[PDB]
Subunit: 488 residues, 3 copies
């Protein structure tokens, strides 16, 4: 048994996120100039708008013809009058007046354009028609639909390489480039304005490492060196530098803008080494004559070797602490997921834990792929393949993209949806259906009861005494009464 | 709330399998000759068969004695006439004729042997008895039971060390050695034939590394070197080579067949180093006099050190990307599995997440082991220990084997089973019972209803109006009628 | 389909725990003197007790006044008479006699102290009152409440730094320091006695590594060396040693007691290097003049480099075997947990696997925090936020502590609870509610039936024929009978 219930409940705990502890093996630093939109990059680059139209002409009930257009039609232009919106930076609403008619009906039927900016202007959804044989235009010029009230979905703020300038773009679905951020906009037009967007332009050094470029030959089926076969050395060598920044390990070139997300560095070039003035003279002109003194070079190397050794040691220890917790993670999650030990072993089998240390393998084997999820007998839903009752829900299974779980650049877009906001204890779920309906199931077992004997042949059909059969017996008995009506 | 439903559904994604990116730290290559059964190794080594017998003698109803043997008896010989089956390579079916009698009854009762091969011969399951007081032999010589229509279970094709020759064996349950593969066979005999089985015998170089063998002393409680205490050097040293191949890291010996699965190399020996002609002269006769020139040796080493440093850097970065995703994997799977943080911490406790960052520890402690799953009060099934209703299902819990999750050599064998093949949306499961019966539970809650008030004292016993009690009231009332039969 | 059922069930398997395989890169050993309470440290340091009192004076029914104190009051002193309990080492129970009265009532009302030790003395829970207008003292001096019958919860046995001496403390909730172990005690007092507690005091060498301490400057925004800018060397350098022991990687100081759990070493100092007598002369006075001979130093380094290279190789291979099994672990657990790929990618989205290789992302976005789990509309329970029926169960969500999943020092304390002991197949659970009630749900679907047609308008209200309505029809019909009582 041992259902450990709650009396002496402890203090709450939190699993702290991983903090990077880079090894101290770097010896060379460069001079770079970081830039960052990110924080001081709140949202602005172009715009958004929205348009309502409501022109109508109430024909009436005799002249039934009223073919009018009270509709939610977002006429969406682009950066034409944005440099004038930049002088007001708000919602320029056109004619909010309604109920035009006849010749001067160019209020709710005219050009859907923007002239007068208001702070928090909105719509009234004009629909009132009261002019028989005349026109009732109902354009309130809808205003106000922004963001998701917290950031904006479909992208985050980043920079892109543009030879020299850093683009505030990022280019996925909806905007210039295509890039939505903190709070103005959803679509194309004008409502998108400075709220803190700048470029920090710092100056850091970016601890790094170097790599020599030695030409190679491909004689026979091997890879020699094209400097060791002939015995000649290399004049004017070239190196390649790899730098490390926050959670990032990239390759700094001579003069470019290597921007993976949101630092988008560019190099200046100072190169500050800290090994030894005589090991920085050997590893720049590698196999030359030079003037190096051995007595120092064979010293520094010793030093360096020790450091490398120590580095390995730390890694080993860390690797151990990662090789144990994983082994304990496949012994407590292999009891829930059946095909967990039938994925780590390559083959396809199903496990079954009979003992808390002993499991047993049953070979639930494999199936082909390339189908369309509608064929003779099987479909998926959650993980595998057992009975339902045929709603015919094909998906057609189009072609997919790679995601590369380790190196990730993927975000963006809404689907539908509402929020998960605050409180009132009626709102209880977990991860899936099984905690979506945990109260309902408990209610079912408790109230309905497993039903060992209670449901007494009630599951037969839909005619228990049809109610009024008993009622008609009742009426006929009531006549038996009356007593054959007191003896006729 | 926020149940994110589906309107703007994205493109399908796929998690790509891991691609190896070995570090460029190797400097020595050897000359090997790979061999591979694997692909061009389809199935063949010996055989399979199956036998039906049906000799009968219909005594009749008066002479009840009919003790005959229409049975599925697979008489299974071994490699006697296989070299003749290799001249036809098909199912040699014996006498398909039936209904023998009397003296010449040696058709369906005689030696169950194989003579005439047919392409797709099968059985008829002869059972017809029509000869009263005579014999009705019913041997169709059953033919046709092969594989699982996709590969063959119980093994895959590999090679084994046989001094010189590579065995196509692999030796687990059923065959020569014991090794079933692509498609002929299940059991012992003859039906198993060449379908593409060859040995490729390629020639690769297998990037590798070396290790020196220095003798050690055990003075006091330490481990010295038996070359540094006395100050003497080593003449004619010996090295040990470790090579790396596809997902494999093994130790190449002088002249052997080191075959871990399915490449089973063997060495020729060329040794092609790419460090320097003067560092390959120092690391072959280590502490000798030699003729090395310092000016070059202290250069190359510098080079080498840089490379090693760079290697560490890459590893560190990769390790970071593995130390974060794991930390995020124990914060979203610790809400489903209760005893997940009570396994990673050594002790036994149960977690409870009250906040999406805060969890709370309850100490569901430990139990002993060595039981037989039937004792006073607890059993297991899935993970732990709470109420059922006693079917008495002991397992007796025999002794187990180690699997060593990291280094795996384990496969093989069927249990029962059917296939999971194509379509029709009625077939919906996941991983366990909880998606085995997801439609049934939803149907239960919807149709049956939680039952707050509906089940009105119906769960009492099995006698609602016994139906005909109302019916008998009805009959007696019908007599009240007749009207006491119109006033007698 | 393919529900792989069980006919040919294999041998049971066990996932073996991780065994450490440290790399052979160490070259320096120290001389330490380990100590260990741990095994030969069974429990003892001070004590435990418990006290019952039962003095009463039965007034009766007329003189209702009986204000007496039969109570479970554990009067808990501390180490006063423990040095006398160390001469008997058992439960010293006071006066077990009861039923005192009048002036000589100092038996069950007097000082609750300990005088006479008995082997397995217990309580009788005296409550019998029989003396009207006299006193009935009922003190049995309760004895016997120890441990949890297996170890003692709230701590394990460890040592703490006390300048020189090793404390058997560990200091969490209940005892000297505060530290409970194998079996005597729960609370403060006397019952806690030697059962095998000693200190082994071994002598090991603890393979280790060194680190040089080079001063650094902070000119501009870089980190130079304060020995390379001026070109001067360092006299009398100082090193820092990092040692590795069982699953532990710590830093050994000059003369201290660095005790992380339960070895609590302290250093003696011998330093036994195995590199070369001339590389141990270069790396002690680093940039000095010395007397080193180059011809040997440039040899040993080569050797060392090879070793380091080989070490990296092994790590790489191991890292590969950890980078694959993880990738296969997020492709079979992402089908159960919805927000598993919406945690590894940083952003918040919900996955949906339509194909066994293809998944689809729906953006279930984020919520704020800092709440008290009772606000307008949402609460948690297991993982997320959907409907319940309002029990008002606020938690108030106090502040939490960090746990640092990798480096763990955290244990201790009970809550409630019972044991999970032996057998009888009625006891079946898994990890949560979903296997807490797996038999009940199956019983529900089977017995109650999904209810397509059976529940025939029975879910209306609580009045089916109110039973006796049919009964009263019956009585009135019985009068119709009697036959209007045989024609009046």
């Amino acid at each position: 048994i041992e259902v450990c219930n709650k009396a002496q409940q402890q203090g709450p705990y939190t699993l702290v996120d991983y903090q990077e502890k880079p090894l101290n093996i770097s010896r060379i630093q460069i001079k770079v100039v970081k830039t960052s939109v990110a924080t001081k990059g709140l949202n602005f680059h172009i715009g958004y708008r929205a348009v309502w139209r409501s022109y109508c002409y109430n024909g009436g009930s005799l002249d039934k013809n009223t073919g009018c257009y009270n509709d939610l039609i977002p006429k969406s232009p682009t950066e034409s009058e944005l440099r004038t919106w930049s002088k007001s930076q708000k919602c320029c609403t056109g004619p909010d007046a309604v109920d035009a008619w006849g010749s001067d009906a160019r209020i709710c039927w005219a050009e859907w354009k923007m002239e007068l900016c208001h702070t928090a202007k909105e719509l009234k959804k004009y629909s009132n028609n009261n002019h028989f044989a005349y026109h009732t235009c109902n354009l309130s010029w809808r205003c106000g639909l922004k963001s998701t009230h917290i950031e904006v979905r479909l992208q985050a703020s980043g920079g892109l390489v543009s030879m020299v300038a850093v683009m505030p773009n990022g280019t996925l679905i909806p905007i210039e480039g295509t890039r939505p951020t903190y709070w103005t906009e959803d679509s194309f037009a004008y409502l998108y304005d400075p709220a803190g967007t700048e470029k920090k332009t710092e100056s850091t050094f970016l601890w790094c490492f170097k790599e020599h470029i030695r030409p190679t030959t491909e004689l026979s089926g091997a890879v020699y060196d094209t400097h060791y076969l002939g015995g000649t050395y290399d004049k004017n060598p070239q190196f390649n530098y790899y730098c490390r920044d926050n959670g990032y390990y990239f390759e700094l070139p001579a003069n470019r803008l290597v921007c993976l997300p949101t630092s988008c560095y560019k190099r200046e070039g100072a190169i500050v080494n800290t090994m030894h003035p005589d090991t920085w003279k050997v590893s720049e002109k590698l196999h030359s004559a030079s003037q190096f003194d051995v007595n120092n070079v064979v010293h520094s190397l010793v030093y360096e070797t020790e450091g490398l050794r120590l580095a390995l040691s730390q890694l080993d220890h860390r690797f151990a602490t990662l090789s144990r917790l994983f082994n304990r993670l496949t012994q407590s999650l292999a009891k829930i997921d059946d095909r967990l030990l039938g994925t780590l072993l390559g083959q396809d089998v199903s496990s079954k834990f009979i003992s808390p240390t002993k499991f047993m393998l049953s070979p639930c084997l494999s199936t082909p792929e390339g189908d369309s999820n509608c064929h003779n007998h099987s479909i998926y839903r959650d993980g595998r393949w057992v009975h339902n009752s045929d709603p015919t829900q094909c998906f057609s299974l189009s072609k997919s993209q790679p995601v590369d779980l380790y190196s990730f650049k993927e975000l963006w877009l809404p689907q539908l949806l509402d929020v998960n906001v605050e409180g009132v204890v009626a709102d209880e779920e977990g991860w899936s259906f099984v905690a979506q309906s945990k109260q309902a199931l408990i209610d079912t077992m408790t109230y309905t009861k497993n039903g060992g004997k209670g449901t007494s042949l009630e599951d037969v059909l839909g005619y228990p005494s049809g109610w009024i059969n008993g009622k008609l017996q009742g009426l006929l008995l009531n006549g038996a009464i009356s007593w054959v009506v007191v003896i006729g």
